[PDB]
Amino acid sequence: AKKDPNTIMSANSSYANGANGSVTNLEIPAAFGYTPDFRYYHAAADYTRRPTIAFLMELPNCFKDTDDAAKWGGSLKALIEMHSRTIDGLDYTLEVEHVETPFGGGGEMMQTLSKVRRARSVPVFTWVEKIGMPVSRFWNNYILYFMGEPNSNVAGIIGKGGITPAATYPDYNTFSVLFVEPDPTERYALRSTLITNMQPTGQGPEMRMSKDQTSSPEQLQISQTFTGLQMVGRGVDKLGQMMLDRASQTGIDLNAQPAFLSDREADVAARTDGYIDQLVSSLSKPGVAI
Amino acid sequence: MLDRASQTGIDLNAQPAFLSDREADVAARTDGYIDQLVSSLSKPGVAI
Amino acid sequence: RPTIAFLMELPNCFKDTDDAAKWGGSLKALIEMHSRTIDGLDYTLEVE
């Protein structure tokens, strides 16, 4: 197995500055000219997108005022990084604008660049409820005790004493997350996004109730939307690469892991009705004589 | 004025319900959900 | 060659019965000795 030494960019310069992994060379022949060449097909390998990963970077300061901030922090981290079944609404696409003027009466136009912009992310997480409904409790109580209460539009936590006068600033009740898309080997960060100023917006967890006894029960699925301020560039890529350097995969193997059970429980051994029991005690053992 | 009208101890998500128990006439009919279990169905026990 | 099934665990509801040993022994014998046939086991791979 050999390929052209010029297949991969060697310097990661020009438009490849700040890249983490390996980049193909755009100057080696492609298939869509006069005719393709089978000597260079290695560079015809294609891109495949991979799931995004979330890293919690900051915590609300309202958790400190509670009796147990450890529980709130751990639950928030678990929801963000493990329980997330689906994430969506991330985008920083570019947009351009121009102006026109007739270059004569024929029908042609002369175009002049005017402005350039970028898209905006609206994160949306999704979960599946658990026994006892901890996710809905978590989010609803977060809103009620840290954001507002409909009958007074005032946070319930103010019902304690000595809450900081600066409790109305975003750092009191907002957190930050870092989103990274790795490569197939989960070693390099191809794209990254830093979103801050997050807290629920719109509908909360659904609180519908109904009665129908002939019908079949169903699963509850939590969908929540969030606010955000987005930053993208090269420093974000460096931060994402540093985070991905952690969580190393050296020395692990998912096909060599021990079975989660080591033996049959003590109750099974107590029973004398099975495969091994018949050989051990039920069957005669006279020996083998030829 | 605003220092008064304190909000300490006030929790509207933990306030007791304005009704604490079912009405006395309602409990006298004995033809509801609880009543069938209390009086209608036999209770021979569970054996298995 | 034929597959062999070994019981590893019993349900905990067996302890809430009058005779848990009988339930456990019956389940064990059914899984191991009375199994006339077993089918449906598969862990094949697939590449897309």
Side-chain angles (χ1 to χ4, degrees):
Chain A
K2 186 176 182 179
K3 62 162 179 277
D4 197 51
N6 304 288
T7 287
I8 313 177
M9 293 177 70
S10 179
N12 278 357
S13 192
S14 304
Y15 52 89
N17 271 274
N20 291 313
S22 67
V23 190
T24 57
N25 216 357
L26 286 188
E27 293 83 3
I28 53 169
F32 298 108
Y34 178 80
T35 196
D37 214 337
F38 289 96
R39 265 184 297 151
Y40 312 112
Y41 81 90
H42 295 270
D46 189 358
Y47 179 75
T48 54
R49 201 166 54 74
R50 304 286 148 147
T52 293
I53 315 170
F55 299 102
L56 183 68
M57 308 270 290
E58 279 203 21
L59 284 151
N61 285 342
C62 50
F63 289 176
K64 295 181 176 188
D65 291 331
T66 65
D67 293 332
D68 192 13
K71 185 162 279 173
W72 281 99
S75 296
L76 180 72
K77 192 158 195 194
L79 282 182
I80 292 287
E81 293 179 353
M82 294 296 172
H83 290 86
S84 63
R85 167 69 181 87
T86 305
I87 310 164
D88 190 74
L90 305 158
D91 185 359
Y92 52 95
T93 292
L94 286 176
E95 205 162 14
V96 186
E97 184 179 2
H98 285 70
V99 289
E100 293 83 3
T101 178
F103 192 64
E108 207 70 58
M109 283 292 220
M110 187 66 204
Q111 282 156 129
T112 298
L113 174 65
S114 185
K115 190 155 166 77
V116 177
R117 307 178 215 247
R118 180 176 272 138
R120 174 181 168 208
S121 286
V122 189
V124 182
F125 290 68
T126 304
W127 296 281
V128 193
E129 201 59 274
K130 290 281 161 274
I131 289 168
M133 306 158 74
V135 181
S136 302
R137 290 183 153 79
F138 179 94
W139 282 123
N140 276 336
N141 290 31
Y142 183 105
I143 292 158
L144 276 170
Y145 293 130
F146 307 138
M147 289 164 60
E149 190 276 331
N151 285 276
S152 50
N153 198 16
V154 173
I157 196 76
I158 307 305
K160 292 181 181 180
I163 318 304
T164 57
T168 53
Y169 292 166
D171 75 330
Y172 191 80
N173 51 6
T174 69
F175 63 93
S176 316
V177 178
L178 173 76
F179 298 74
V180 175
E181 173 211 355
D183 73 342
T185 59
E186 293 83 3
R187 299 185 286 179
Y188 316 106
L190 291 179
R191 293 179 292 173
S192 301
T193 303
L194 190 60
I195 306 191
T196 190
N197 192 32
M198 282 197 218
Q199 75 177 339
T201 197
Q203 296 294 141
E206 198 147 331
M207 294 298 102
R208 283 202 155 291
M209 294 167 72
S210 182
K211 170 199 179 85
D212 197 15
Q213 284 161 296
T214 51
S215 76
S216 194
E218 59 184 351
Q219 291 177 319
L220 169 59
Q221 317 209 332
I222 309 297
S223 177
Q224 189 73 73
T225 310
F226 298 86
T227 57
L229 277 169
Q230 178 187 224
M231 183 177 176
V232 299
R234 297 195 183 176
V236 182
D237 280 357
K238 290 177 180 180
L239 169 59
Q241 182 63 34
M242 182 179 72
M243 294 299 291
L244 200 65
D245 291 331
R246 306 175 188 158
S248 58
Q249 303 163 212
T250 60
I252 62 170
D253 195 307
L254 304 168
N255 204 73
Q257 294 197 138
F260 52 86
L261 294 174
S262 66
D263 215 356
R264 80 290 187 274
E265 53 167 43
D267 303 65
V268 178
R271 296 295 86 193
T272 184
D273 51 22
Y275 200 92
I276 305 190
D277 291 331
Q278 193 200 285
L279 287 155
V280 163
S281 307
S282 193
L283 268 193
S284 186
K285 211 154 283 184
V288 163
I290 196 71
Chain B
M1 294 298 102
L2 200 53
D3 277 347
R4 261 167 286 184
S6 187
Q7 299 174 129
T8 56
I10 287 174
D11 195 23
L12 283 72
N13 202 238
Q15 269 179 338
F18 62 99
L19 297 169
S20 59
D21 198 60
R22 79 288 182 278
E23 193 195 336
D25 291 331
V26 166
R29 296 300 89 208
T30 60
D31 72 7
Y33 184 91
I34 297 169
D35 313 320
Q36 162 156 301
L37 283 147
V38 188
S39 312
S40 186
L41 295 170
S42 162
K43 295 177 181 177
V46 170
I48 206 76
Chain C
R1 308 288 153 156
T3 300
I4 307 151
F6 301 99
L7 192 70
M8 303 274 113
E9 293 179 353
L10 305 161
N12 280 333
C13 51
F14 285 1
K15 316 318 163 213
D16 278 290
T17 70
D18 52 8
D19 207 17
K22 183 178 184 293
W23 271 102
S26 288
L27 180 69
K28 186 164 158 60
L30 271 164
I31 287 290
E32 305 209 14
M33 294 298 102
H34 283 267
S35 50
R36 169 69 175 87
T37 289
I38 304 170
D39 189 358
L41 317 177
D42 174 345
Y43 55 81
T44 315
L45 280 184
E46 188 148 356
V47 193
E48 190 276 331

